[PDB]
Design an enzyme around this catalytic site. Structure first.
Site, PDB file in Angstrom:
ATOM      1  N   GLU A  48      -3.904  -4.576  12.559  1.00 38.14           N
ATOM      2  CA  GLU A  48      -4.323  -5.930  12.163  1.00 38.14           C
ATOM      3  C   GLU A  48      -4.214  -6.042  10.626  1.00 38.14           C
ATOM      4  O   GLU A  48      -4.499  -5.088   9.901  1.00 38.14           O
ATOM      5  CB  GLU A  48      -5.751  -6.202  12.665  1.00 38.14           C
ATOM      6  N   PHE A  49      -3.682  -7.160  10.143  1.00 36.32           N
ATOM      7  CA  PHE A  49      -3.513  -7.362   8.694  1.00 36.32           C
ATOM      8  C   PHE A  49      -4.780  -7.951   8.083  1.00 36.32           C
ATOM      9  O   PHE A  49      -5.320  -8.936   8.609  1.00 36.32           O
ATOM     10  CB  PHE A  49      -2.353  -8.349   8.439  1.00 36.32           C
ATOM     11  N   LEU A  50      -5.135  -7.494   6.879  1.00 36.90           N
ATOM     12  CA  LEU A  50      -6.155  -8.190   6.093  1.00 36.90           C
ATOM     13  C   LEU A  50      -5.672  -8.465   4.688  1.00 36.90           C
ATOM     14  O   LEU A  50      -4.890  -7.690   4.142  1.00 36.90           O
ATOM     15  CB  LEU A  50      -7.467  -7.402   6.064  1.00 36.90           C
TER      16      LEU A  50
ATOM     17  N   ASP B 276     -12.361   9.876   4.661  1.00 42.38           N
ATOM     18  CA  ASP B 276     -11.862   9.494   3.339  1.00 42.38           C
ATOM     19  C   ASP B 276     -12.101   8.002   3.001  1.00 42.38           C
ATOM     20  O   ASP B 276     -11.173   7.267   2.643  1.00 42.38           O
ATOM     21  CB  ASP B 276     -10.374   9.881   3.202  1.00 42.38           C
TER      22      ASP B 276
ATOM     23  N   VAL C 276       4.207   4.661   3.241  1.00 45.36           N
ATOM     24  CA  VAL C 276       4.189   3.295   2.714  1.00 45.36           C
ATOM     25  C   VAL C 276       3.477   2.411   3.742  1.00 45.36           C
ATOM     26  O   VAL C 276       3.578   2.662   4.941  1.00 45.36           O
ATOM     27  CB  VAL C 276       5.636   2.757   2.470  1.00 45.36           C
ATOM     28  N   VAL C 277       2.672   1.458   3.263  1.00 41.67           N
ATOM     29  CA  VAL C 277       2.129   0.399   4.113  1.00 41.67           C
ATOM     30  C   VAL C 277       2.869  -0.890   3.793  1.00 41.67           C
ATOM     31  O   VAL C 277       2.995  -1.294   2.636  1.00 41.67           O
ATOM     32  CB  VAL C 277       0.601   0.218   3.948  1.00 41.67           C
TER      33      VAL C 277
ATOM     34  N   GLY D 298       0.840  -1.172   0.000  1.00 37.87           N
ATOM     35  CA  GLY D 298       0.000   0.000   0.000  1.00 37.87           C
ATOM     36  C   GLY D 298       0.874   1.220   0.000  1.00 37.87           C
ATOM     37  O   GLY D 298       2.016   1.195   0.454  1.00 37.87           O
TER      38      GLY D 298
HETATM   39  C1  LIG Z   1      -3.032  -7.200   1.767  1.00 36.15           C
HETATM   40  C2  LIG Z   1      -3.479  -5.759   1.952  1.00 36.15           C
HETATM   41  C3  LIG Z   1      -4.790  -5.471   1.226  1.00 36.15           C
HETATM   42  N1  LIG Z   1      -3.621  -5.452   3.374  1.00 36.15           N
HETATM   43  C4  LIG Z   1      -3.682  -4.126   3.837  1.00 36.15           C
HETATM   44  C5  LIG Z   1      -3.473  -3.044   2.987  1.00 36.15           C
HETATM   45  C6  LIG Z   1      -3.577  -1.767   3.531  1.00 36.15           C
HETATM   46 CL1  LIG Z   1      -3.320  -0.381   2.531  1.00 36.15          CL
HETATM   47  N2  LIG Z   1      -3.877  -1.501   4.803  1.00 36.15           N
HETATM   48  C7  LIG Z   1      -4.060  -2.547   5.624  1.00 36.15           C
HETATM   49  C8  LIG Z   1      -4.354  -2.616   6.967  1.00 36.15           C
HETATM   50  C9  LIG Z   1      -4.534  -1.494   7.821  1.00 36.15           C
HETATM   51  N3  LIG Z   1      -4.686  -0.591   8.504  1.00 36.15           N
HETATM   52  C10 LIG Z   1      -4.471  -3.964   7.272  1.00 36.15           C
HETATM   53  N4  LIG Z   1      -4.243  -4.740   6.166  1.00 36.15           N
HETATM   54  N5  LIG Z   1      -3.964  -3.846   5.171  1.00 36.15           N
END
Ligand SMILES: CC(C)Nc1cc(Cl)nc2c(C#N)cnn12
Length: 290
Positions: free
Chosen positions: A73-75, A119, A17-18, A11
């Site tokens: 938390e990751f998704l 947003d 940056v993510v 991201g």
């Molecule tokens: C695998 C990606 C879609 N996971 C993701 C991407 C982004 Cl931009 N932000 C996230 C968070 C938060 N906050 C959790 N998982 N993601």
């Protein structure tokens, strides 16, 4: 950050940056946002207590060396691609309804505590294999403001921006979030962005071409707003039957309520959860391609 091992870039947020990252002691897989004030840390630290099943969970806030890291938390997938991946056949309606339903729950939670998103957009709506959907970046805008370009110069999308924001209202309310989510609901239904504007005036004129140029009749006090102009062309409002076919009558009804011009008329999240559209809501599990 010592405690985190970056896996990959996932991201390029508005703010930095993510990364997908792993914690070197708990084993935790996390989303790491690297951010670029005294207020800000105070607002963010409140975000830590704003906990809801449909809000991406803020695990930790790291301030160090003037670098700021938010640990989430990751998704595994976001809506924007989930939509892109469903282009050929669209997202099934009972899944559209589950997603909307859950997002409104997340909004009724935040809004009850007076937190706005500001947003919302398909990119920051995150989904899992379990049929859940969660709002990411909730509250960072009050903390950091919303720039015209991202840190990588990428334009911030206007497509979901409420009309009171576009018309220059300084003290807009939780209603902005309902507008954006309205926009996204239409977009899941039709497989096309409702108002894909490419400048502020293009955005506004798109809204106007679909819902009618607003006036004092439908939006008391519109003409007094900062960026309103009398010289706005005056377009007629299109029926929703034309805007979001094959959306049924309950769905078209709810949608109109979420896109009321007048933010005080616009339906709230908590009222939206009582709308008859959700009478038969269920929780399907999408198929994802992990
Ligand atoms: C695998 C990606 C879609 N996971 C993701 C991407 C982004 Cl931009 N932000 C996230 C968070 C938060 N906050 C959790 N998982 N993601």
């Amino acid at each position: 950050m010592e405690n985190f091992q970056k896996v990959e870039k996932i991201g390029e947020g508005t703010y930095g940056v993510v990364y997908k990252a792993r914690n070197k002691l708990t084993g935790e897989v996390v989303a790491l946002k690297k951010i670029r004030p005294s207020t800000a840390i105070r607002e963010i630290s409140l975000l830590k207590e704003l906990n809801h099943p449909n809000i991406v969970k803020l695990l930790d806030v790291i301030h160090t060396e003037n670098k700021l890291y938010l640990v989430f938390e990751f998704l595994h997938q976001d809506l924007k691609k989930f939509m892109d991946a469903s282009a050929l056949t669209g997202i099934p309606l009972p899944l559209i309804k589950s997603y909307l339903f859950q997002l409104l729950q997340g909004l009724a939670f935040c809004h009850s505590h007076r937190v706005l998103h500001r947003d919302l957009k398909p990119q920051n709506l995150l989904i899992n294999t379990e049929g859940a959907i969660k709002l990411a970046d909730f509250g960072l805008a009050r903390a950091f403001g919303v720039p015209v370009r991202t840190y990588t110069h990428e334009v911030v999308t206007l497509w979901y921006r409420a009309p009171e924001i576009l018309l220059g209202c300084k003290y807009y309310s939780t209603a902005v979030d309902i507008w954006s989510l309205g926009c996204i609901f239409a977009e899941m239904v039709t497989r096309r962005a409702l108002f894909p504007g490419d400048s502020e005036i293009d955005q506004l004129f798109r809204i106007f071409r679909t819902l009618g140029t607003p006036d004092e009749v439908v939006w008391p006090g519109v003409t007094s707003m900062p960026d309103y102009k009398p010289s706005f062309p005056k377009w007629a409002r299109q029926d929703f039957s034309k805007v979001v076919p094959p959306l049924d009558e309950d769905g078209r009804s709810l949608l109109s309520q979420m896109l009321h011009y007048d933010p005080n008329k616009r339906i709230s999240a908590k009222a939206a959860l009582a709308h008859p559209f959700f009478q038969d809501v269920t929780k399907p599990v999408p198929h994802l391609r992990l």
